[PDB]
Design a protein around this ligand. Structure first.
Ligand code: NA
Length: 156
């Protein structure tokens, strides 16, 4: 299956298959990107200001809420992110029929994929850094992938 999120080594070879998500983000660009994965909470501008790790060239994972998916992606894109992962912490069930409205430049320049909660926790288990307490996130939450690992996103 193409639509997939994979944890790869520095050669791009699979180390863990995180998910082959069933749903597909409407209006997302088709691309295969690889980079460090960075948690940006809800993807609001304040959350990105809260980051200590550079967004430039990384894949961003945000949870649903507060703002539209498009606003999250636009915030990540503005900071030179290469891709976005969206999940829901409140339930195990997937985001159904994800769609992007229009903000900023009016089109999503970077690939966007929704993933299940179990997939996100799979990613957090392979990431480093405890999430800020003000985020009120689950204890599983983690901020960044370590040096040893990178995430590969393949969309549509
Ligand atoms: Na950070």
């Amino acid at each position: 299956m193409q639509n997939s999120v994979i944890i790869v080594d520095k050669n791009g070879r699979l180390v863990y298959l995180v998910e082959n998500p069933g749903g597909s983000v409407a209006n997302s660009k088709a691309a295969t990107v690889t980079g460090k994965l960075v948690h940006a909470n809800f993807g609001t501008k304040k959350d990105f200001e809260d980051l200590y790790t550079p967004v430039n060239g990384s894949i961003v994972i945000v949870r649903a809420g507060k703002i539209t998916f498009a606003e999250k992606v636009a915030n990540a894109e503005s900071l030179n992110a290469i891709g976005v992962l969206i999940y829901m912490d409140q339930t195990k069930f997937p985001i159904v029929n994800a769609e992007l409205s229009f903000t900023g430049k009016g089109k999503s320049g970077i690939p966007v994929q929704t993933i299940s909660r179990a997939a996100a926790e799979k990613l957090f288990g392979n990431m480093e850094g405890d999430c800020p307490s003000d985020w009120k996130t689950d204890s599983t939450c983690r901020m960044v992938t370590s040096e040893s690992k990178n995430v590969k996103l393949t969309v549509s």
